[PDB]
Amino acid sequence: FIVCLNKVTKSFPPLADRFMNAVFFLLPKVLKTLCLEVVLCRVEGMTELYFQLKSKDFVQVMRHRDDERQKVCLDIIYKMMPKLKPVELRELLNPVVEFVSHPSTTCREQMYNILMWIHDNYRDPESETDNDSQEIFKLAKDVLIQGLIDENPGLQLIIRNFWSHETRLPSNTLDRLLALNSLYSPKIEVHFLSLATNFLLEMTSMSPDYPNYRHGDLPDIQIKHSSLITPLQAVAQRDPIIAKQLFSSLFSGILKEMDKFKTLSEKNNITQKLLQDFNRFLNTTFSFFPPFVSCIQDISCQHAALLSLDPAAVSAGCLASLQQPVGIRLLEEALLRLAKRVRGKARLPPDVLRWVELLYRSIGEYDVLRGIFTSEIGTKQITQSALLAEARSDYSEAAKQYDEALNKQDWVDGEPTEAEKDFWELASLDCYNHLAEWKSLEYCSTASIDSENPPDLNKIWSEPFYQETYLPYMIRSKLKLLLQGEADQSLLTFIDKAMHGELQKAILELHYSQELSLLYLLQDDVDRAKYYIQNGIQSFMQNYSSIDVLLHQSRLTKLQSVQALTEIQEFISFISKQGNLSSQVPLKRLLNTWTNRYPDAKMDPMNIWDDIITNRCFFLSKIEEKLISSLIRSCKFSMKMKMID
C-alpha cells in the first residue's frame, strides 16, 4: 500500500503525518528498496516540525548503505538544513565528511554544497556563542580543502574554486596574497601548487586578466603575445611537478611593492605571522614531506627574518632529501651579524644536516669543534683523535672521565659543556666504538634511563625529545649477543612491543628492516624474512633520490645496501630448495658456493663490509645444525682465515 502511497507523492498533496507511523515501521521491514521510496516521499511532506524519531534512525542507516541508489538520501537532508540546531548539527555533520570515498559522486555534489550553505550561513562576526558549534566551522573547511582537487569532474574544482573567490578571497591582490597562505597550511595533501597558480594568474591584479612569414608577429611583438604565454603556463603545470619557479618569482613581486609604499611596521608584523604559518607547515604535514617541492620552495624565501629553529627540516627534512644551507645563511649575516646572542641552537642543526649522510663528518668535524664549544681540553683530546683515526683508543680514555670524575677540576668550562658537551659527548658516546659491538656499547646507550635495566624508558624514549636518535645503536649491539647463546635480550622485549606497537609504533619504525630479516634466522621461518627484506630493497630504492654531490651520498647509500641485501637474498634463495638439495646429495655443490664468496671484494670503507662478515658466519652455523665435516671445517678454517688477515 505504501509503494502506491508514493505515486500520489509524485504530484504533491500528501500528509507526511497521516502516514508517519507508516514512514517509520516500513524502514525496518528486499529491505532497503521499500524504504528509499518513503524517503523521497518524506521530502515533500517535509519542512515540518520535530526530528526526535527521524534523527535516531537516520545517521544509523546513512553509513550502513554502501548502496548508492539508497544514497540519494544525502541530497534529501538538504531540506533538513534550515530547521537547524547547533549541537544537533555536530552529530549529523559526521556522515557528510565521510562521503568522499564512495563511487557514485552523485551525493558529493550535495556532500559539499550543504557544507557550502552551512559555511556561508554560519559566517558570524565570531560571536563565539558555542565552543562546540565553533568546532563545526573548522571541521567544515577541512572538507572544503580535502575536496578542492582529485575528482574526475573538473567542475567540482571550478565551482569550489570560484567559491574560494566570490566573497571569500578578497578582490584585492596583496590581500588575496595574505589570505591564500592561511588556506595552504591546513592542507595535509600534495598539490595545491596548481591552486596557487590558477588563483593568482587568472586574477592578474585587476578585475580582468589582461588590459591590453613576415606579416603577423612583426607589427605587434608586444601586446598580443603576453595574454597567451600567460595561460599556457599554469596548464602545463598541474600535469607534472616542477612549477616551483613561479613562487619565489612571486615572493619578490610580493616583497617589492611592500617596500616603496606601505609602512615598515605593519609589513614586519605581517611577515612575522608568515613564520607562524610556516611553523604550521612543520606540524600538519610534519613528516608528510615526500614531494620535497613543498619543502625547498618555502625555505627558499631569502628574506631577512626567515630563521626558524627548523627542527622539522631536521627530521622531516630527512624525508625531504635536501641539504639545506638555509639555517646557516642567516646566522652568517642577516640574523645576528651585530656567546649569548650567538644562536642558542641554530648552530647545531648544521651538525645534524652534515650528520644525516655520514664525508660530511669531516666537514662536520672541523666545524664541530674549535668552532663553537670552548672546552679546550675536551676539544684537543677529541679533535686530536679524529686525526689519529685511532679514536677507539685515544678519545675514549680522553672522554669518559669528564662524566665519571664529576668535574674534579675547576671545570669552569665543564659548566658550559653541560648544556653542550652533554650532547657532543652523546655524539661521542656511540662514536667511540665505530664498531666492535661489545656489551660495553649496549650498556653505553641504555645507561640514559634508570640505573637498573629499564625497558619502559626504552620504548618510551621513542616518544619524547631526543633519545630516539640512538635507537638503532642499541640494536647493532644485538650482533655481539647474537654471537652468544642466550637469545633472551632484545627479542623478548622487542618482538612483543612490535605486536602491541604494530598499529602505530612498530610499522612506523619498521623502516629499518635489515635487522628484522636477521632475527628470523633464530626461529626457522623464512617467509616474513623475505617479505620485510623485499620492502627493504624497494625503500633504499627511494633513498636513491640524490645525484648532486652524489659520491658521498651514494657511496654510503649504495656500497652497503646492495651488498648486504644480496648476501642475504643469495643466502635465502640458496638455502631452501638449493640448500635442501645440496645438503642431501652433493657436498661439492656446497663448495661451489664458497668460490663465489671468496672473490667478493671490499670497498676501502670498513663497517658493513666488516658487518656482513657476521652474516656469512650465521649462514654457516644455521646450516651446520640443519645438516663432509672436515670439508666444512676446512671452509671454516678458510673463510675464517680470510676475514681475519
UniProtKB/Swiss-Prot annotation:
TPR repeats lie at residues 352-378, 379-412. The modification N6-acetyllysine is found at K642. Changing S248N: In a metastatic melanoma sample; somatic mutation. It comes from the Eukaryota. The modification Phosphothreonine is found at T173. The modification Phosphoserine is found at S227. Autophosphorylated at two clusters, the T2609 cluster and the S2056 cluster. Autophosphorylation induces a conformational change that leads to remodeling of the DNA-PK complex, requisite for efficient end processing and DNA repair. It is found in: Nucleus; Nucleus, Nucleolus; Cytoplasm, Cytosol. Residues 74-627 are annotated as: KIP-binding. DNA-PK is a heterotrimer of PRKDC and the Ku dimer (composed of XRCC6/Ku70 and XRCC5/Ku86). Formation of this complex may be promoted by interaction with ILF3. Component of the core long-range non-homologous end joining (NHEJ) complex (also named DNA-PK complex) composed of PRKDC, LIG4, XRCC4, XRCC6/Ku70, XRCC5/Ku86 and NHEJ1/XLF. Additional component of the NHEJ complex includes PAXX. Following autophosphorylation, PRKDC dissociates from DNA. Interacts with DNA-PKcs-interacting protein (KIP) with the region upstream the kinase domain. Serine/threonine-protein kinase that acts as a molecular sensor for DNA damage. Involved in DNA non-homologous end joining (NHEJ) required for double-strand break (DSB) repair and V(D)J recombination. Must be bound to DNA to express its catalytic properties. Promotes processing of hairpin DNA structures in V(D)J recombination by activation of the hairpin endonuclease artemis (DCLRE1C). Recruited by XRCC5 and XRCC6 to DNA ends and is required to (1) protect and align broken ends of DNA, thereby preventing their degradation, (2) and sequester the DSB for repair by NHEJ. It is linked to Immunodeficiency 26 with or without neurologic abnormalities: A form of severe combined immunodeficiency characterized by reduced or absent T and B cells, recurrent candidiasis, and lower respiratory tract infections. Some patients show dysmorphic features, severe growth failure, microcephaly, seizures, and impaired neurological functions. Belongs to the PI3/PI4-kinase family. This is DNA-dependent protein kinase catalytic subunit. It comes from Homo sapiens. The lineage of its organism: Eukaryota, Metazoa, Chordata, Craniata, Vertebrata. The gene is PRKDC. The chain holds residues 2360 to 3244 of 4128 of the full protein.
